[PDB]
Swiss-Prot record, chains A, B, C, D, E, F, G, H, I, J:
Soluble monomer. Homotetramer. A dynamic intracellular population of tetramers and monomers coexists normally and the tetramer plays an essential role in maintaining homeostasis. Interacts with UCHL1. Interacts with phospholipase D and histones. Interacts (via N-terminus) with synphilin-1/SNCAIP; this interaction promotes formation of SNCA inclusions in the cytoplasm. Interacts with CALM1. Interacts with STXBP1; this interaction controls SNCA self-replicating aggregation. Interacts with SNARE components VAMP2 and SNAP25; these interactions allows SNARE complex assembly and integrity. It is linked to Genetic alterations of SNCA resulting in aberrant polymerization into fibrils, are associated with several neurodegenerative diseases (synucleinopathies). SNCA fibrillar aggregates represent the major non A-beta component of Alzheimer disease amyloid plaque, and a major component of Lewy body inclusions. They are also found within Lewy body (LB)-like intraneuronal inclusions, glial inclusions and axonal spheroids in neurodegeneration with brain iron accumulation type 1. Cu cation binds at H6. It is found in: Cytoplasm; Membrane; Nucleus; Synapse. This is Alpha-synuclein. It comes from Homo sapiens (Human). Belongs to the synuclein family.
Length: 55, 55, 55, 55, 55, 55, 55, 55, 55, 55
């Protein structure tokens, strides 16, 4: 076989899960957050996949 | 087989799940948030997939 | 087989779920949010798939 | 088989769900929000798929 | 088989659900929002699929 | 102060919420159920406050 | 002060929430159930407060 | 002070929450269940407060 | 002070939370269950407070 | 002071949390369960407070 990509690719066979991202956010997984009190200014309480590039 | 992509591709066979994103947000997964009190200015309480690029 | 894409594609066979996004938001998954009090100015309380690019 | 796309495509066979988006928003999934009080100016209380690009 | 698209297409067989969007909004999924009080100026209380590109 | 009750009482001051029940059911709280398919014979799908005393 | 009860009482001061139950069910709290498929005969899918005394 | 109870009492001062139960079920707390597939005959999927006394 | 109870009592002062139960179930706490697939006959998947006295 | 109980009592002062139980189940605490696949016949997957007295 032959393949040429510029990116971003994701090429496969017999594949149970696939995610391609440029951005941005993708949530595909099981996630449970239980929480009782959030205070403070300002605290990232429960972050799973996170990116902060403030300018 | 032969394939040429510019991106972003996601090419496969026999594949249970697929996500392609440029952006942007995609939520495809099970997610449960239970929460009782959020305060503060300003706190990211429960973030799963998150991207902040303020300018 | 043969395939040429410019992107964004999502090409497959025998595939249970598919999402293609450029944007933008796509919500296809099970999601439960239970919440009792949100305060503060301004706090992202419960974000699942999120993108903030304010200029 | 043969396929050439410019994007955004989503090509498949035997496929239970499909979403193609350029925009924009698509909501196809089960979603339950129960909520008791929202205050503050201005707090994104419960966001599932979200994109904010204010200029 | 043979297929050439400009996008946005969504081509399939044996497929339970399909959405194609350029825009715009599409709501096809089960959604329950129960809510008791919304205040503040101005807070996105419960957003499922959302896109804000104010200029 | 003085108080004598036989029950069921609920005596208070400065009190935001009150429920007295003998029975029977009382629903006073925020509740959101979103649901897509219920089958089976016979399955309690989503029960919040529940009592079954079949004889 | 003086108090004599037979039960069930609930006596208080300065009290934000109160529930008295003999029965029976009382739902006063925030609750969100999101659900996609229930099968089987017969399975209690999502039970929060539950009592089964079949005879 | 003086108090004589037969039960079940709940006597207090300056008290934020109170529950008295004989039964029966009481749900006063924040609860989020997100769920995608329930099968089997018969499986208690997600039980929070639960009592089964079948005879 | 003086107190005589038969039970079940719960006597206090300056008390943030109180639960009295004979039964039965009481759910007052924050709880988040996220779940993707339940099978089998019959498996208690996610039980928090649970009592099974089948006869 | 003087106190005589038959049980079950719970007598206190200046007390943040209280639970009295005869039964039965009481859930007052923060709890997060995230889960992806449950199989088998029959396996207690995730049990926090649990009692099984089958006869
Ligand atoms: O609002 C728009 O104008 C954006 C926009 C509008 C579209 C419309 C389609 C139909 C429309 C109609 O019909 O009206 S409008 S598509 C689209 C975008 C796609 C991808 C974008 C990306 S991808 C990326 C990075 C990738 C990798 C990085 C690293 O590694 O740093 S950064 C940034 C951006 C943007 C940014 O600068 O934030 S914007
Ligand atoms: O970068 C920041 O400064 C903003 C910022 C920064 C935070 C940090 C947290 C931890 C940090 C650390 O630890 O470093 S930083 S939270 C936060 C914001 C929350 C909500 C905002 C809203 S909500 C809204 C509208 C809602 C409804 C409208 C209608 O109807 O028009 S407009 C606008 C905005 C903003 C705007 O465009 O003005 S900004
Ligand atoms: O003790 C057991 O055997 C029962 C049992 C044992 C399990 C184990 C799991 C792991 C174990 C291990 O690892 O050891 S054991 S799960 C389970 C049951 C689930 C649901 C049941 C239902 S649901 C229902 C009705 C619903 C609706 C009705 C209407 O409308 O009348 S009646 C009745 C029953 C039962 C009945 O009274 O018959 S029993
Ligand atoms: O259905 C009923 O008949 C029971 C029932 C019915 C009532 C009604 C009220 C108004 C009604 C109307 O108006 O119609 S009916 S109250 C009540 C019960 C309270 C407490 C009970 C307990 S407490 C306990 C244990 C405590 C500790 C143990 C260890 O350590 O082993 S076991 C068991 C039981 C029961 C059991 O054997 O399962 S049952």
């Amino acid at each position: 076989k032959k393949g040429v990509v510029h990116g971003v690719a994701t090429v496969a066979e017999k594949t149970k899960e696939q995610v391609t991202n440029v951005g941005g956010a993708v949530v595909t997984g099981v996630t449970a957050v239980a929480q009782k009190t959030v205070e403070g200014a300002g605290s990232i309480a429960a972050a799973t996949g996170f990116v902060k590039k403030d300018q």
